[PDB]
Design a protein around this ligand. Structure first.
Ligand SMILES: Nc1ncnc2c1ncn2[C@@H]1O[C@H](COP(=O)(O)OP(=O)(O)O)[C@@H](O)[C@H]1O
Lengths: 48, 55, 65
């Protein structure tokens, strides 16, 4: 049960926001690592 | 218990959409004889289907 | 488990405060509800239908109560 609850909130939600302001551009990579807190974070490239 | 049911009709019946879901929870009544009408009528229009008895 | 008057409701109140802040992981941020057994018998069979409708939305959404 926590499968789709964690992916759609910590992996798919943050990635969908970067595709609007300019975080993830169609032509680069999407680095997904663990931060110092212990969660799923996406290392963004460019800013807003 | 979910992926094995979806892959059953998508491979043998060649149609993943031919899967019905009968949640056995609200049907816990005494008049569930001549009413379940619902499961018999659904399989009449489609003999090639998968009947699931959830819970 | 405690004496009738120690603060059983306040235990769930403090857990919901950390969800709004950020001290709860996203995999555990579940909606907190108060299952009132008396609200199902409101007004002067019927109890079995109202009990199933409440215990169904929490399963498809994965939330505590
Ligand atoms: N540590 C606490 N800090 C603030 N309020 C508390 C604390 N412990 C208990 N309470 C209060 O005590 C009340 C207990 O209510 P409840 O357990 O529903 O019935 P009862 O008052 O009979 O114990 C709660 O409304 C809560 O606000």
């Amino acid at each position: 049960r926590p499968l789709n609850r964690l992916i759609q909130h910590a992996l798919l939600t943050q990635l969908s926001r970067l595709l609007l302001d300019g975080g993830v551009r169609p032509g680069e990579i999407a680095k997904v690592t663990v931060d110092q807190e212990g969660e799923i974070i996406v290392i963004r490239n460019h800013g807003i | 218990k979910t992926l094995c049911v979806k892959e059953l009709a998508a491979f043998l019946f060649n149609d993943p959409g031919a899967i019905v879901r009968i949640d056995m929870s609200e049907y816990m009544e005494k008049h569930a004889v001549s009413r379940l009408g619902q499961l018999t009528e659904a399989v009449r229009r489609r003999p090639y289907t998968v009947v699931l008895f959830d819970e | 488990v405690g004496e009738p008057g120690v603060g059983k409701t306040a235990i769930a109140e403090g857990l919901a405060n950390r969800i709004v802040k950020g001290d709860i992981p996203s995999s555990l941020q579940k909606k907190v509800y108060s299952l009132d057994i008396g609200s199902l018998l409101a007004g002067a069979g019927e109890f079995e239908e109202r009990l199933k409708a409440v215990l169904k939305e929490l399963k498809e959404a994965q939330a505590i109560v």
